[PDB]
Scaffold this active site. Structure first.
Site, short mmCIF file in Angstrom:
data_model
loop_
_atom_site.label_atom_id
_atom_site.label_comp_id
_atom_site.label_asym_id
_atom_site.label_seq_id
_atom_site.Cartn_x
_atom_site.Cartn_y
_atom_site.Cartn_z
CG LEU A 1 42.30 34.85 39.89
CD1 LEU A 1 43.35 34.31 40.83
CD2 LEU A 1 40.91 34.45 40.35
CG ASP A 2 39.66 41.02 41.18
OD1 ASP A 2 39.78 39.87 41.63
OD2 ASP A 2 38.91 41.88 41.68
CB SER A 3 43.79 44.31 42.34
OG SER A 3 43.40 44.83 41.09
#
Ligand SMILES: CCCCCCCCCCCCCCCCCC(=O)OC[C@H](COP(=O)([O-])OCC(O)COP(=O)([O-])OC[C@@H](COC(=O)CCCCCCCCCCCCCCCCC)OC(=O)CCCCCCCCCCCCCCCCC)OC(=O)CCCCCCCCCCCCCCCCC
Ligand SMILES: CCCCCCCCCCCCCCCCCC(=O)OC[C@H](COP(=O)([O-])OCC(O)COP(=O)([O-])OC[C@@H](COC(=O)CCCCCCCCCCCCCCCCC)OC(=O)CCCCCCCCCCCCCCCCC)OC(=O)CCCCCCCCCCCCCCCCC
Ligand SMILES: CCCCCCCCCCCCCCCCC[C@@H](O)O[C@H](CO[C@H](O)CCCCCCCCCCCCCCC)COP(=O)(O)OCC[N+](C)(C)C
Ligand SMILES: CCCCCCCC/C=C\CCCCCCCC(=O)OC[C@H](COP(=O)(O)OCCN)OC(=O)CCCCCCC/C=C\CCCCCCCC
Ligand SMILES: CCCCCCCCCCCCCCCCCC(=O)OC[C@H](COP(=O)(O)OCCN)OC(=O)CCCCCCCCCCCCCCCCC
Ligand SMILES: *P(=O)(O)OCC(C)(C)[C@H](O)C(=O)NCCC(=O)NCCSC(=O)CCCCCCCCCCCCC
Lengths: 178, 125, 459, 104, 87, 63, 67, 128, 174, 219
Positions: free
Chosen positions: E41-43
């Site tokens: 995932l990411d921010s």
């Protein structure tokens, strides 16, 4: 609340906070769940559109314009969780929070009404008194000569030690004390 | 609310009646023989019944009868329909009398305007 | 009055001959007995006063003040015994002696029948108060406060002495009865204007009048608890009693000479309430509230109508009791945390419930809450001022609004909110402190129950 | 203190102050119970203009409706005994000017 | 009034929400799976997950603390510590 | 039983005391308790003197 | 009675509260219908409103313009 | 674009709309670091005193002491008679007094003139 | 009742209409009145009878203090302190009596307004005139004496009023 | 002055009410609007209608506040209609009680609020009053209907928006009995009180049909 703040917020942190605030205000505008999902997907599409940018000056300009747009388009009465600072249930139980130092001023009869609790309280008090010197020694050993550069505290580096400055954090009143 | 307000404000207030100054014509102007209104209840009867001063109009006797009917049949608070209807009908008749007075005032004012316009035209000619 | 004067002069040797640990018990018991004896002066006549002898007499205005003084002495004893635990025996006896001398002088001042003896005694009340302040005060400013208090009072009161001896030479007698029966109108001349100024200005400085009041915050903040209690409860009422006494011989010049003092009193009432709104010190807030209430009393005396005198007397009694209770509460808070800053200690409602109740009652009585005698006096004064003129109602309404504002601000700041985390020396309230608050508050409610006893001769 | 950050672990959470930091001169009036200066969704000038315009327009329209009243097309109400002369406190000795109401 | 929370209940609810997340494979999701190191995932995804947890449990997590919650176990521990759950 | 004990004390004792206070103390000074005089209608019987207040005149009846 | 909490499910209801709510709604509607059946003049009026224009000048006492 | 927001004294400028928040010099970063260091040092001292188990009483706050001293006892020594202070003091202290004197004097003069001319409604005015 | 004087405190005769029911429904007011009489009136009457029987065994009396008239301030010489004292005391007693007279008239007015109810504007005109006259006389007597009122001040005010009346009469006759 | 003050009060409070998201705030503004209506009633020289409306408003407004409190307590101290939804079938009894209260508040032709608000509107239309005040009174009645509809729509109709842990439970005898007692009053008390009090004002028997039906039309 539990995390020590930094000297500044990075660009990533600023844009993430803007993203969360915009999503919350959009949910305030879009009352219904499916409509909120649609418009939140559109908002994340905008963020992903501008996600990849090498020019930090242009990224900062885009952030500034987005902040101005949010301020113009914010909800005048955004939804706030009841326990959040703006909420209707904020600080309602602060009058029910009584500290343990207030607890120890009880009459002997009141103390005798709870015989088992106060034995464990005495054990906790002895544990607190037997660690303060090691805690202060650890604190003064690891600090820079100039002084503390941040509010973060070190953990217990030894098997028999407790983290320095732990008493009030550990013994803080419960969120629903009474 | 009504058309009379529009006629008086967005129109000729001179021809429309003035509610605060009405009547402005003699009561016998146009009526050869006019009968004075008849009052049934007496001052002493109204005073004893303790009618409010706003309720001591010409429909007071029906109100007194209604009050007497209500007092006697107290637990049955639904047995005064006939007296209530009689009082309401008397009030309705009083209201239509007031409406007739207003209409008479209006048409007398417009007749006066027509007469004065005719006299002015004759003087000009 | 000798049946009350002599027991005080016997309180003195009893205190000085008692044991080192029985001084407080003996003094409190016998002061309470003297107060009970003095309760018998409330039985007054509707026509004239009680003329005991050529030297002393009692009136419907003097009786409530005497009862208040005699009831106030034991409360001062309790507070003093609170804050003088480590003092030596001789110094404790000296403190009790100062309090007893102050009470004796106040009793004789209220019962004196001549203006010159009244002046001598009401000036004699300066020495014990000055000694108490400048000797048992806590901070450095006690010396400056004593100097300010002393010199304000004396600079006010010396022309009063000159005017009194002049009046005696002119008319033949300073006896109050004679100057009441043989009164003559005061013509509009410069000499009469200056005589009026001498008398009124002396008592106004004693009141205090707005613009002549800085000594009151200085002294009340820096005095010990007993000094703060006596200064606000009784020593401020000497000016009102004197003005109600001397205005017999100042007519009709009072009609023309009262305008500047009325304007000063009203505007300064507004200004001192506003000052109370922004006070960082609790004792200063109480002191300026006292100034505002006394300004209202000044307005009542200056307008000088039968409805204003009753309101003035009722307000004087009520303000004495309320200010004494407020000073006691603030002193307990100070003894807890050793500081007078208002925001230093918070959450005292969740730490000390019964004291929160006492604070609530004291603040409710401080603002005009019906049917309290505070409200009775304020309402009578407001009605008399309305009959005087129709903008006084605007000024009085402004003052009432600001009074409620600052009273509730003090209550909320001290008691409500969350407790200060680092203050962990707040022990449970003492039976002595709770009894002190109860003995402050119950007489006020009983006087509310029976209000004709504090409405003065004009009733 | 309302503008100050609510999520920080202040020494005095209610006052939102830290121990040792300099205190504003007007802290007494800037507490969370008193004057608030936090940013508003709408500009202060715009809020003032809107509120003043609303209240002024309402007062003007009240004056307009007062000089142009609303009523019904009826005559004055009639009362029997000289517009109730005695019942309203009239002097019995003095004879009032007669008030006669006819039929229509 | 409301029934008290427990550690097992908190863990079950957070894993329920995470398995209802589409970008997360339910089979390879464990209580110690890192959102960015081993979940990919990411921010923004982490922010959305935190917002979903806030909506689930009815309380707000401040941004200063929310950025550091990179693990379902960390989320469980944070919620339990804030709600004073010890069992 | 609890409702009966509550009813006798809390309701019966105060009404007894208040009736005793009103009948023999409050209504012992003039004008303390003033009752609005009862309304008298035509065709009525005043009970003080056995008086007959007569009926009103004939109504000009409509329909 | 004890109602168990539900997770993401419709809450458990009670026959007593169901029937009470239905009964009170039916009572309100029955009362409204019963009241409207008897005295509908409170809503629809009871007396006709005259038209002033249909009144004759003879009965209103208005003489001819020439006279 | 979107209408701008005009900050006032009673409606301050939000941090996210501050132009200086997006133009960060390298000196601004070290200034922020110094501010954080000062806050951390003060917090460390306070926390040591707060968590000391042998401490009983109040942790005296020098900042609070300075504030209370500056608010009351430090005003007069730093006061100088300037034209601004003189005019403001004269106005705020004397203008209201003469204003109220004029108002009350005028009202009482009108009332007394009415009384002397005998056309003031004073019936039933028994209490005064 | 004989506790007060019917002339000093008049009450018009009470005309209570006779009940004329027109329905077969029972009267809850009548039933509750009967219950109240059974449960409260009889016990309180028995208690009062016992108390009054106890009182009659120890019957003692108290009297009304009588003050004789004394020379007034008009007869008192200038600065004759004893005569001035007597006159001032008599004047104060008369002032108290006048205040109580005004109180009696006000009580009459209030009672009449409450009794007449909806017809007070007409039926209370008799008590309004008496109150008007009494208030006018009381105001002319003690209107603006001040807080330090005295018989001398009242006498000076009366002299001023008499001089004004004499001047007005002379101007009218001229 | 009283008429103008009441008119501006009711209009302004209703206008603020129609767009609030806190249910307690909406009910408070409804109370303020009803107070303005009472002040208007006093200004047109109808003191007794004001008292009658005081009684009726007490009844149904107390019931509405109790229902709102029940909703708030069931959703774990949530006071936002943006988080309420599905309560029509989730909570039957509070739903029917709130519907009855809103019908009485808006002036349903034969509920408790009918015997006061309808007469007040009729007397306002039939009196020599301020035209602007009359217009503001009518607009305030329309906005009253509007915010009652807003409360119902955003609190009971649609799909749930509250947190998934459903703690909804309104089966407490205390709550049920209190709402039952205040629910009978919101239906029958107005009729009894109107038919028992003596006539203390002259009725408005004759009026145009459109003026007779004005309250229902604007509602
Ligand atoms: C300076 C500005 C100024 O004159 O302000 C007056 C003003 C008084 O209020 P005001 O309502 O304007 O006066 C009404 C008329 O103007 C004046 O009233 P009037 O014209 O109706 O006649 C009454 C007048 C009759 O005239 C005289 O008697 C004048 C004869 C000389 C008197 C000199 C003062 C004697 C008393 C000692 C005062 C010590 C202070 O009475 C006085 O003058 C009273 C003198 C005492 C005044 C108050 C003293 C306490 C002041 C407290 C604050 C001090 C700082 O303020 C002060 O007096 C105090 C502040 C200024 C000093
Ligand atoms: C109880 C309730 C409360 C009661 C009330 C309580 C409060 C009321 C009582 C206190 C009232 C306020 C204080 C009274 C005056 C105190 C003055 C003082 O101590 O000055 C020493 C203080 C220290 O002396 P410095 O160190 O040699 O001068 C330093 C200055 O910064 C040097 O400044 P600069 O060199 O820049 O000067 C430029 C300018 C400074 O003045 C201004 O900027 C203000 C101009 C308007 C005021 C004057 C208006 C009238 C002018 C024509 C007069 C014609 C008379 C015929 O000079 C002038 O305007 C020329 C002199 C004007 C004299 C007027 C009187 C003769 O000097 C000043 O403050 C200079 C200005 C003094 C006058 C200011 C305005 C006074 C208004 C009084 C109204 C009553
Ligand atoms: C509804 C809300 C009701 C709440 C009221 C709560 C109080 C309970 C009810 C009141 C108690 C019944 C009333 C008693 C009352 O009548 O007695 C009062 C008596 O109260 C006392 O007088 C109050 C004493 C006040 C002085 C106490 C001094 C104690 C030492 C304190 C000294 C400090 C005071 C300093 C200034 C003097 C008034 O006197 P009075 O009505 O006619 O008595 C009738 C007997 N007669 C006919 C023979 C005359
Ligand atoms: C510097 C300017 C000083 C102004 C303030 C005054 C204070 C200084 C006092 C110096 C005396 C000034 C006033 C003198 C007045 C005076 O002597 O006459 C009063 C009169 C004289 O009349 P005869 O001599 O008998 O002649 C009969 C005429 N046919 O005698 C009296 O009435 C007695 C009055 C006592 C003198 C009062 C003087 C003080 C005036 C009041 C000021 C009060 C100050 C109080 C200070 C508090 C606030 C600072
Ligand atoms: C919607 C917009 C409305 C705009 C209204 C503008 C102002 C109209 C105006 O000035 O009308 C006044 C005129 C004369 O009436 P008058 O009593 O003299 O009022 C003048 C008061 N300064 O008024 C008239 O001509 C009509 C007067 C009607 C009076 C009715 C009874 C009072
Ligand atoms: P993670 O570390 O992966 O986060 C990725 C980030 C964002 C940190 C990137 O690495 C990054 O910094 N990229 C470049 C900087 C950047 O993204 N700039 C643009 C971001 S702001 C923008 O483009 C989006 C704003 C548009 C929407 C604004 C919302 C305003 C409307 C709100 C109205 C309120 C009610 C709806």
């Amino acid at each position: 609340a539990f995390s020590a703040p930094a000297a500044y917020l990075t660009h990533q942190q600023k844009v993430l906070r803007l993203y969360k605030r915009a999503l919350r205000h959009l949910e305030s505008w879009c009352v219904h769940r499916d409509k909120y999902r649609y418009f939140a997907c559109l908002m994340r599409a905008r963020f992903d559109e501008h996600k990849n940018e090498k020019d930090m000056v242009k990224a900062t300009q885009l952030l500034r314009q987005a902040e101005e747009e949010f301020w113009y388009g914010q909800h005048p009465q955004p939804y706030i969780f009841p326990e959040s600072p703006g909420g209707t249930s904020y600080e309602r139980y602060e009058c029910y929070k009584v500290p343990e130092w207030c607890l120890d001023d009880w009459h002997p009869s009141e103390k005798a009404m709870y015989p088992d609790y106060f034995a464990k309280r005495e054990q906790w008090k002895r544990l607190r008194r037997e660690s303060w010197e090691r805690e202060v020694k650890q604190l003064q050993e690891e600090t820079p000569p100039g002084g503390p550069r941040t509010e973060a505290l070190p953990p217990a580096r030894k098997e028999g030690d407790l983290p320095p400055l732990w008493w009030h954090i550990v013994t803080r009143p419960r969120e629903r004390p009474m | 609310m009504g058309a009379h307000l529009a006629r008086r404000y967005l129109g000729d207030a001179s021809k429309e009646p003035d509610p605060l100054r009405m009547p402005t014509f003699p009561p016998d102007y146009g009526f050869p023989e006019r009968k004075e209104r008849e009052m049934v209840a007496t001052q002493q009867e109204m005073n004893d019944a303790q009618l409010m001063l706003q309720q001591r109009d010409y429909c007071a006797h029906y109100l007194i009868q209604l009050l007497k009917c209500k007092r006697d049949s107290f637990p049955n608070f639904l047995a005064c329909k006939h007296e209530q209807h009689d009082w309401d009908y008397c009030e309705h008749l009083d209201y239509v009398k007031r409406m007739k007075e207003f209409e008479r005032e209006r048409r007398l004012l417009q007749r006066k305007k027509r007469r004065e316009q005719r006299e002015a035209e004759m003087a000009r000619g | 009055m000798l049946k009350i004067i002599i027991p005080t002069t016997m309180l003195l040797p009893m205190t000085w001959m008692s044991k080192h640990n029985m001084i407080w018990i003996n003094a409190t018991v016998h002061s309470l007995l003297i107060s009970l004896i003095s309760l018998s002066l409330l039985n007054q006549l509707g026509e004239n006063s009680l003329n005991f002898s050529l030297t002393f007499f009692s009136d419907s205005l003097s009786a409530p003040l005497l009862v208040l003084t005699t009831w106030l002495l034991p409360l001062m004893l309790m507070a003093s015994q609170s804050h003088l635990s480590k003092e030596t025996t001789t110094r404790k006896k000296l403190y009790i002696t100062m309090l007893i001398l102050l009470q004796l002088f106040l009793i004789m001042t209220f019962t004196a029948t001549e203006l010159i003896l009244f002046y001598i005694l009401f000036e004699a009340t300066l020495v014990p108060t000055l000694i108490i302040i400048t000797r048992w005060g806590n901070q450095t400013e006690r010396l400056n406060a004593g100097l300010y208090f002393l010199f304000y009072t004396l600079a006010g009161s010396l022309p009063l002495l000159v005017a009194l001896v002049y009046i005696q030479n002119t008319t033949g007698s300073l006896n109050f009865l004679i100057i009441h029966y043989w009164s003559h109108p005061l013509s509009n001349s410069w000499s009469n204007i200056f005589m009026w100024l001498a008398c009124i200005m002396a008592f106004m400085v004693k009141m205090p009048l707005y613009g002549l009041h800085l000594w009151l915050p200085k002294a009340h903040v820096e005095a010990p608890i007993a000094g703060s209690m006596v200064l606000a409860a009784v020593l401020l009422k000497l000016g009102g009693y004197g003005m109600m006494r001397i205005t017999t011989i100042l007519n009709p010049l009072t009609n023309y000479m009262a305008y500047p003092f009325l304007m000063l009193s009203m505007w300064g009432m507004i200004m001192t309430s506003s000052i109370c709104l922004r006070q960082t010190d609790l004792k200063s807030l109480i002191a300026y509230s006292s100034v505002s209430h006394m300004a209202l009393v000044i307005v009542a005396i200056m307008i000088q109508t039968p409805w204003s005198f009753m309101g003035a007397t009722a307000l004087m009694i009520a303000h004495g009791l309320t200010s004494s209770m407020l000073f006691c509460l603030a002193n307990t808070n100070y003894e807890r945390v050793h500081s007078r800053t208002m925001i230093l200690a918070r959450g005292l409602q969740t730490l000390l419930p019964l004291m929160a109740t006492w604070w609530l009652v004291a603040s409710l009585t401080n603002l005009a809450l019906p049917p309290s005698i505070n409200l009775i006096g304020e309402l009578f004064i407001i009605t008399a001022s309305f009959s005087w003129s129709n903008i006084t109602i605007i000024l009085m309404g402004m003052n009432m609004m600001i009074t409620a504002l600052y009273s509730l601000y003090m209550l909320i700041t001290t008691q409500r909110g969350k407790y200060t985390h680092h203050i962990n020396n707040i022990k449970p309230s003492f039976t002595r402190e709770n009894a002190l608050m109860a003995l402050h508050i119950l007489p006020l409610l009983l006087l509310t129950l029976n209000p004709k006893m504090i409405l003065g001769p004009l009733y | 203190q309302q503008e100050r950050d609510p999520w920080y672990d202040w020494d005095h959470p209610d006052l939102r102050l830290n121990w040792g930091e300099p205190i504003h001169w007007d802290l007494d009036m800037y507490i969370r119970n008193r004057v608030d200066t936090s940013p508003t969704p709408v500009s202060w000038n715009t809020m003032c203009k809107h509120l003043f315009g609303f209240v002024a327009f309402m007062l003007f329209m009240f004056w307009v409706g007062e000089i142009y009243p609303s009523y019904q097309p009826v005559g004055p109400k009639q009362y029997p005994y000289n517009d109730l002369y005695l019942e309203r406190g009239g002097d019995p000795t003095k004879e009032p000017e007669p008030v006669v109401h006819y039929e229509i | 009034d409301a029934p008290p929370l427990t550690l097992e209940a908190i863990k079950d609810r957070v894993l329920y929400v995470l398995k209802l997340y589409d970008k997360i494979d339910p089979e390879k999701l464990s209580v110690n799976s890192h959102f960015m190191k081993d979940l990919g995932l990411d921010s923004l995804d982490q922010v959305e997950i935190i917002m979903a947890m806030e909506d689930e449990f009815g309380f707000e997590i401040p941004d200063i603390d929310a950025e550091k919650l990179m693990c379902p176990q960390e989320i469980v521990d944070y919620i339990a510590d804030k709600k004073d759950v010890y069992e | 039983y609890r409702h009966s004990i509550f009813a006798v004390t809390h309701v019966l004792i105060p009404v007894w005391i208040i009736h005793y206070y009103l009948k023999y103390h409050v209504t012992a000074k003039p004008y303390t308790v003033v009752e609005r005089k009862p309304r008298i209608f035509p065709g009525d019987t005043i009970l003080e003197t056995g008086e007959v207040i007569p009926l009103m005149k004939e109504f000009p009846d409509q329909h | 009675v004890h109602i168990e909490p539900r997770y993401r499910q419709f809450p458990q209801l009670t026959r007593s509260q169901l029937i009470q709510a239905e009964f009170f709604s039916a009572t309100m509607w029955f009362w409204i219908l019963w009241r409207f059946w008897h005295d509908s003049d409170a809503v629809l009026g009871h007396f006709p409103y005259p038209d002033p224009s249909q009144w004759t000048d003879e009965e209103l006492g208005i003489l001819p313009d020439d006279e | 674009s979107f209408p701008k927001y005009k900050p006032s004294r009673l409606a301050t400028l939000p941090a996210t709309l501050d132009p200086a928040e997006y133009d960060i010099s390298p000196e601004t970063r070290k200034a922020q670091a110094e501010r954080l260091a000062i806050r951390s040092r003060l917090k460390r001292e306070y926390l040591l005193q707060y968590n000391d188990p042998n401490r009983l009483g109040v942790i005296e706050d020098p900042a609070l002491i300075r504030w209370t001293y500056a608010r009351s006892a430090n005003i007069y020594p730093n006061f100088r008679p300037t034209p601004k202070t003189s005019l403001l003091g004269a106005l705020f202290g004397i203008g209201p007094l003469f204003f109220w004197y004029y108002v009350f004097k005028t009202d009482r003069d009108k009332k007394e003139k009415l009384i002397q001319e005998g056309k003031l409604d004073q019936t039933f005015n028994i209490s005064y | 009742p004989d506790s007060w004087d019917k002339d000093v405190y008049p009450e018009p005769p009470r005309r209570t209409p006779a009940p004329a029911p027109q329905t077969s429904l029972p009267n809850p007011v009548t039933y509750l009145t009967k219950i109240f009489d059974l449960l409260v009136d009889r016990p309180v009457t028995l208690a009062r009878e016992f108390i009054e029987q106890q009182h009659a065994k120890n019957r003692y009396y108290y009297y009304h203090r009588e003050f004789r008239r004394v020379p007034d301030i008009t007869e008192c010489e200038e600065k004759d302190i004893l005569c001035m004292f007597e006159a001032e005391m008599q004047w104060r007693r008369d002032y108290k009596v006048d205040q109580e007279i005004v109180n009696i008239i006000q009580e009459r007015l209030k009672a009449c307004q409450q009794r007449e109810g909806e017809s007070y504007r007409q039926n209370c005109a008799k008590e309004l005139e008496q109150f008007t006259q009494v208030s006018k006389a009381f105001q002319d007597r003690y209107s603006d004496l001040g807080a330090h009122y005295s018989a001398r001040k009242c006498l000076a005010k009366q002299k001023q009023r008499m001089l004004a009346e004499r001047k007005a009469a002379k101007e009218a006759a001229a | 002055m009283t008429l103008c003050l009441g008119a501006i009060t009711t209009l302004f409070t209703a206008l603020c009410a129609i767009t609030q998201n806190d249910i307690k705030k909406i009910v408070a503004f409804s109370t303020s609007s009803q107070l303005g209506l009472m002040m208007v009633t006093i200004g047109i020289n109808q003191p007794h209608l004001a008292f009658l409306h005081i009684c009726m408003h007490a009844f149904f407004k107390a019931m509405l506040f109790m229902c709102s409190g029940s909703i708030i307590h069931s959703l774990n101290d949530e006071q936002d209609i943006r988080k309420m939804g599905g309560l029509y079938k989730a909570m039957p009894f509070t739903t029917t009680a709130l519907i009855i209260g809103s019908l009485a508040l808006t002036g349903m032709p034969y509920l408790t609020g009918f015997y006061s608000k309808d007469l007040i509107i009729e007397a306002v239309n039939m009196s020599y009053t301020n035209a602007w005040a009359l217009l503001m009174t009518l607009i305030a009645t329309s906005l009253t209907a509007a915010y009652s509809t807003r409360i119902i729509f955003f609190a009971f109709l649609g799909k749930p928006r509250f947190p998934p842990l459903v703690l909804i439970n309104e089966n407490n005898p205390l709550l049920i009995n209190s709402i039952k007692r205040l629910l009978i009053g919101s239906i029958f008390a107005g009729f009894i009180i109107s038919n028992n009090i003596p006539p203390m004002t002259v009725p408005n028997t004759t009026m145009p049909l459109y003026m007779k039906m004005t309250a229902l039309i604007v509602t």
